[PDB]
Design a protein around this ligand. Structure first.
Ligand SMILES: CC(=O)N[C@@H]1[C@@H](O)[C@H](O[C@@H]2O[C@H](CO)[C@@H](O)[C@H](O)[C@H]2NC(C)=O)[C@@H](CO)O[C@@H]1O
Length: 129
């Protein structure tokens, strides 16, 4: 599914991401735009053999198990295929676990390069939430 910007914002708001660990809703919408262009089916392989899955490009080395990654820690206790669903529940529940690490949302490389520090509140402007 390719989400629209305000459609995704509303889905994320109903799952408790607004102001989760200090981060306003626009941070998560910005992270999903630069990680996957709002595409639930996005995947990218990493050099080490893990793959990043779904709308938030969560990797299989630490977070989900895809079968193909030797020594996946699977900290979110989910198969990586669950992150490819049009339903984003599993992706946001896992995202909350990774944003609980010491560097918070800096675990999303696209967020730290293209979103961090900017007026991220713009990403939810005009959405009826
Ligand atoms: C939360 C999450 O999974 N974010 C992804 C990053 O982890 C990806 O970064 C890359 O991750 C692998 C697995 O740890 C590292 O081997 C790799 O070096 C690292 N790459 C970079 C440039 O940091 C990232 C890949 O674009 O995608 C999500 O942000």
């Amino acid at each position: 599914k390719v989400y629209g910007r305000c459609e995704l914002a509303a889905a994320m708001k109903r799952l408790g991401l607004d102001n989760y660990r200090g981060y306003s809703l626009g941070n998560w919408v910005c992270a999903a735009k630069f990680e996957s262009n709002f595409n639930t089916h996005a995947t990218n392989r990493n050099t080490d053999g893990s793959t990043d899955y779904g709308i938030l490009q969560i990797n299989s080395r630490w977070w989900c198990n895809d079968g193909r990654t030797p020594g996946s820690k699977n900290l979110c206790n989910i198969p990586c295929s669950a992150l490819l669903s049009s339903d984003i529940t599993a992706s946001v529940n896992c995202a909350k676990k990774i944003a609980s690490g010491g560097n918070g949302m800096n675990a999303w490389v696209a967020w730290r390069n293209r979103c961090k520090g900017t007026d991220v509140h713009a990403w939810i402007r005009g959405c009826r939430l």
